[PDB]
Amino acid sequence: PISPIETVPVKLKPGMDGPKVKQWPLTEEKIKALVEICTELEKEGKISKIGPENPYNTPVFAIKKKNSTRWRKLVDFRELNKRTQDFWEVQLGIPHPAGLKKKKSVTVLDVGDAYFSVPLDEDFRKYTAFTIPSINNETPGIRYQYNVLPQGWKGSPAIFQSSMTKILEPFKKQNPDIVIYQYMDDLYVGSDLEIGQHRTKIEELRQHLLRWGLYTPDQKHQKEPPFLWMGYELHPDKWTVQPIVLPEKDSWTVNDICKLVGKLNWASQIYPGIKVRQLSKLLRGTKALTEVIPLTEEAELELAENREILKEPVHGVYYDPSKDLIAEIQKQGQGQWTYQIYQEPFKNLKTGKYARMRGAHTNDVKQLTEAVQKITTESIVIWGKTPKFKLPIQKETWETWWTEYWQATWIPEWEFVNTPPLVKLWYQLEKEPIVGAETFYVDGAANRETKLGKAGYVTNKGRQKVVPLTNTTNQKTELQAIYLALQDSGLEVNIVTDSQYALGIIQAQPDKSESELVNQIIEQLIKKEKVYLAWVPAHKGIGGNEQVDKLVSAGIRKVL
Amino acid sequence: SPIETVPVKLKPGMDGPKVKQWPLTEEKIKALVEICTEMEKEGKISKIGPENPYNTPVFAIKKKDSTKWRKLVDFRELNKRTQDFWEVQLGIPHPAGLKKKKSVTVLDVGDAYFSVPLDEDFRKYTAFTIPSINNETPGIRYQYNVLPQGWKGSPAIFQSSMTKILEPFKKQNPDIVIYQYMDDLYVGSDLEIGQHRTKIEELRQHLLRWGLTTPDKKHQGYELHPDKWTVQPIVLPEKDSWTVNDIQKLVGKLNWASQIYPGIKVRQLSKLLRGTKALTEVIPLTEEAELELAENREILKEPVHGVYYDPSKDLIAEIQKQGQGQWTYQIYQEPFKNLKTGKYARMRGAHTNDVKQLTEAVQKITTESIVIWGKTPKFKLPIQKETWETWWTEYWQATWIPEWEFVNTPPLVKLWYQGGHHHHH
DNA sequence: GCATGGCGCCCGAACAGGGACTGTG
DNA sequence: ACAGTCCCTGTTCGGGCGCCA
Ligand SMILES: Cc1cn([C@H]2C[C@H](N=[N+]=[N-])[C@@H](COP(=O)(O)OP(=O)(O)OP(=O)(O)OP(=O)(O)OC[C@H]3O[C@@H](n4cnc5c(N)ncnc54)[C@H](O)[C@@H]3O)O2)c(=O)[nH]c1=O
Ligand SMILES: [Mg+2]
Ligand SMILES: [Mg+2]
Known part of the structure; x- marks a missing residue:
């Protein structure tokens, strides 16, 4: 039975018409499945055969189900969805077992053909038109048009979930004390009643739905401690992820690495210490799912240590x-x-x-x-x-x-x-200058055309140095300078500069960096005992700042 | 006896707001759900579906002296898209007065707005979605049917009314200035604090007679005093002796300052660091140096020129x-x-x-x-x-x-x- | 030659902004 | 004295995968 719940009004975006994309080549074997299915959804009144006048169509297809024992009809409304009004999704996040409280009794139900039980706005039905090929493809098959939520549409998920909430509203009011987690058509009902009393409510509910078209097959956990829910195993006092099976293979392709890390990351839920760092570097830079990337040292090792963790299974405790x-x-x-x-x-x-x-x-x-x-x-x-x-x-x-x-x-x-x-x-960094320490005035400069650079320092004790640089940036030089000043520095040094950029990086006390140079500067700073970097407005002729400049900017701004 | 509405033409090529809801805490949600049930009961808001493509986040807050939760919508983004409406068609004028008054009090008059119904067309844009803890259920969606607390367009509509409600009060008290900015009313006077508060208490009252509510506090000063507000600028340190480090830093500020005020001169002081010396090394400020310094220190008193709002x-x-x-x-x-x-x-x-x-x-x-x-x-x-x-x-x-x-x-x-x-x- | 919504992770490209040279006026 | 350009860094957004339905 279809549902007696008001349809949600949907429209196409302004100026746009329906989809007219042809049906593509289908497995003769597979076709069977759809023809089978469509004959059922027909008598059930979920879809309807349509006349010649309807100019719209959309390729359809099947796909194995959970137990590959049946098939779920899918539609490729990809072209329809782009011509369809936007929806605000009402699914905000995903439930989590660790956020669940204990309840003396529990049950979980699912809705048979869930989408297919929620009426589809009438006038919108036109565009949901598709075409099922004949077993041998001699002549045009049957043109059908959905009357209920069709899988593969922007609207289906949100429509249902919203409509499924309206259905549970009455029931929820009457039994404030029952707990119901609803993810799509998946229902988890937990209470503190006695097993029998529980079953009762569950009967109300299961029936309550039935009055609304929400059929409820007997493939819903009843009196079972291991509850299969949202990808977990829910036990009276504990829970855990469902059997997590890491792939095992000699050589790996880009995509293979993905499937891996995604698996491992999903295990990070409860399996402590799982790391995918190195493994992830393998997919750095543009690559292709097919390309066969090689597992470096670390990765081989990581995947290993990470593989030895999934050995002894873990469990999580409820809230x-x-x-x-x-x-x-x-x-x-x-x-x-x-x-x-x-x-x-x-x-x-x-x-x-x-x-x-x-x-x-x-x-x-x-x-x-x-x-x-x-x-x-x-x-x-x-x-x-x-x-x-x-x-x-x-x-x-x-x-x-x-x-x-x-x-x-x-x-x-x-x-x-x-x-x-x-x-x-x-x-x-020291708050005040250090007495009796070499005061390094440092700078550097570079030519944004030749990319050449001189980074130099000069101290009050008359010591001095400038180095030439192949292809650098006016910024890096200023950095280099401070490096030099720190290398040739003592154990207690004073460093003045005009580079905020540099000064800036250093003042936040970094201990890591993607910049080779900085790690060197870093390293050098740890080794120091009392550093103190100062700032001075560039090109202002101040103390030694003036000099270093003269030096470092020797053959890069002389004449034109 | 019907009650009218003002159509809120949205700006051309302007799409409504679509902001995801940010996760709220246990209490925040609880309180928000309650606030919403009533508002839905009193017909302020109505439940909507997903056919509505818009959204705005909401949350709750607990004010000082108050132990009641207040719903708060972040129409910040809607305000932006509805500016021509409240800044041009219907705009509340700002009087230079309370800037000057000796005391200003702020009243949460906003509750008034629930009284007028919101245009039907503009309603689609007031959508909001309440989240659920650990995601028990898909967010519930509602939209306002009456001027909402937080939209700048609400105070724009009520202007017509609010003014009338106030003509009397404004008549007997010709000195008190009242400004209405969004959900608030800034009431300022030159009276004495004791009398001021009283005039305020009278205003609260005046409001009650015209059905308007003003949340009251658990009562455990508060009011703003636009007098103790003083613009205080940059001040060059003054020390007995000076070191290179010091003069450098000083030239630092001064240099930066020369951006604000163009009078700052650094010439003479610069000379002091004429040549590469040590930092801790002490330096005596010269005659022309000391002058310049003090010369500068003076400039930092007179605020810049061209600072016209x-x-x-x-x-x-x-x-x-x-x-x-x-x-x-x-x-x-x-x-x-x-x-x-x-x-x-x-x-x-x-x-x-x-x-x-x-x-x-x-x-x-x-x-x-x-x-x-x-x-x-x-x-x-x-x-x-x-x-x-x-x-x-x-x-x-x-x-x-x-x-x-x-x-x-x-x-x-x-x-x-x-x-x-x-x-x- | 194979769809939808939701969240998570990782990656990199695209776009933004802010200081500092550079050239012309 | 004010654009035009470059370097560097931060943020967003899109693709892929995992997981749920
Ligand atoms: C995973 C997935 C989900 N979805 C959307 C669309 C779908 N709603 N529907 N229809 C909804 C719920 O997913 P679910 O995994 O529950 O599939 P669905 O609800 O479609 O079918 P369900 O899985 O509930 O059905 P089964 O578990 O395969 O079988 C239940 C049994 O009950 C009997 N049964 C069911 N309906 C009837 C009936 N009308 N009459 C007699 N017996 C029935 C029958 O014997 C069958 O073996 O999510 C999607 O679009 N794509 C996906 O890849
Ligand atoms: Mg189902
Ligand atoms: Mg420099």
Whole structure:
């Protein structure tokens, strides 16, 4: 039976007409499937045969189902969708087991031919016209036109979900105490009644739907502890991902690496420490899904260590609102971070990782801060609150930071945990000049046409140096200078410069970078004991600044 | 007895807003769902489907002295697309008055707007979607059927009414100036605080007789005083002795300053660093040097020339983190042509949470702008997009929301806007 | 020669903005 | 004294994959 629920009004974008794309070559064998199906949807009144006047059409096709025991008709309304009004999607996120609370009784149902049970706006039906070929392709098959939500349309998912919510509204009102998670047509109903009483409600519901056209086949979990839901196994007290099967092969293609990392990342949900960093580098730069990329050293190793983790399966524990949450993070590797949120020490509620490296030059504090924020958000989405943080960073370290960094910054309630490695700033620039230390005035310059460059320094103790540079940028030189000044520097040095660019990078105390040079500058700074970089308006004839310039900009701005 | 509506012609080639909803907290949602059930009951809003292609985010807030949650829509983007409507067809005029008054109070009169019905056509654009915790269910969508709290177009419509409601009050009190900017009413007078508050209490009353509600507080000063507002500019440090480092830095500021005021001269001071010396090395300021310095120090007193406000341009606000819980900001329309410049101190009855402070600071700057130009500035916030987008709502306390923008640019100019002048005692 | 919506991750291209040279006036 | 250009960095948006339906 179709549904008695009001259809949602849909329209095509202004000035545009229906689709008139022809039916493409189909498997004679496959065709069978569709012809079978269309004969059913016909008597069921879900679709309708149509006359000659209808000029629209859209290629259709089948695809194996979950158990490959049947087939799901799909339509290629790709051309229709572009000519169709926009919809605001009502699906905001995805449920998560770790956000689920315990309930004495539970059940989960699904809707047989779900889309196919929600009436499709009448006047829009015209365009949903398609054509089924004859078993032998002698003469035109039967032209059909959907009367219900057709798979492969912008509107179907959102229409249904919205209409499926309207259906559950009454029922929800009457039984405030029942919990119903609805993802599409997938229903998870959990309560604190007794097994039998439960079944009752479930009968109401299952029937309630039936009055609305939402048929409910007996392929819905009833009295089973292992509940198959949203890709997980839901147990009375615990849960976990469903069997996760990493691919096993000698050589790999680009696409193969994707399928891999995507699998591994989906496992990061609960399997702590999973890393895909290196594996991901393999797909750097334009490539092609087919191209056969080779697993480097790391990757081979990573995939391995990462493979030894999926050995001993893990489980997650459900959510208890009766006690605040805890999220702990640790520094995985350079750039990489992993975390886990729990309520009881060993019982991890859920795990994850944060590797995204944002920026050219940063450090650990800032990245650490990023994860905090990343988790905070993710936590509000699942539980609605922000958890307490256990961070491997000195309370003193951080205070220094936020009280010295020029940008506003903050971390919620958090406590220090001495679980190595530990985050810390690797050096600090002196606030005031150091007495009795070589004062390096540094600069550099370059020709934006020859790309040649001189980066030089000159000190008060009369020492001096300039180096020539093949193809550089007016910026890099200024950088080089400071490098030179730091190399040839002592253990306590003063460095004045006119380069904000340079000065800028250094002042944020970086401990990582994509810039070769900077890492060198970095390294050199750690080794130092008391550094102090100063700034001075370029071309203003100040102290030694004036001189270095004269030097470094020797043969790049003389004459034209 | 029917009740009319004003059609809201949207600007040509203007598409409505389509903003995704940002995840709210346990309480925020709870409270928001409740606020929405009633509003839907009182017919303020109605449930919509996905056939409507528009959206705007919403959230909730709990104000000072208040323990009731207030719905808050971010029509910021709708406001932008509906500007010609409220800035041209029907625009609330800004009186230069309260800028001058000795005391201004702000009333949340906004609730009035629910009283008038919103045009049917423009309604599609007021859509909003309430999220659900851990995504139990697909977001519920609603749209307003009455002027909504937060759209600049609402105060534009009610203008007709509000004025009438006030003609009496404005008659008996010919000195009090009242400005209506969005959901608020700025009431300013020269009276004494005690009498002022009273006149306010009378205004609240006056409003009640005309059915308008003004949320009341749990009552545990508050009101703004456009007098203690002082534009304070740059100050060259003054010390007994001087080192190269010092003179350099000084030339720093001065040089940067020469951008604001063109009078600054650096010539003589530059001479002091004539030649490559050590930093800690001490230097005595010469006769011509000392003059120039003081000569300059004088210039920094008279504000620039050409700082004339111009309604046809946007208003830009910049905040500098000075630390120690101290903050500084400048508001301008064209670079180096500051229209104002102040600071921001510590929290009373609260803590030192870096972010929260900016949040408070930003709001501070905004009202001052409202009071002074009856426009909101575009803020250049000194904090990472995420850090901010993570907690600004958690500390926000105003019905309006400014148009912010993020930026990072350290004190390369070495503390160009803070305390420097401190000689020996 | 094979579709839709939603979220996640990773990658890189496209576009934006801001300081600093450069040339012409 | 003001565009025109270059370097560098940050943000958004699109493609692929994973997972759900
Ligand atoms: C995965 C996927 C989903 N979807 C959209 C469209 C689809 N809605 N519909 N129709 C909705 C729900 O997905 P679901 O995975 O539940 O598929 P659907 O609801 O289409 O069929 P379902 O999977 O529920 O059906 P089965 O699990 O294969 O079989 C259930 C059994 O019940 C009996 N049964 C079902 N209907 C009837 C009936 N009318 N009369 C008698 N017996 C019936 C029958 O014996 C069958 O074996 O998501 C999509 O567009 N593409 C996809 O790739
Ligand atoms: Mg189904
Ligand atoms: Mg230079």
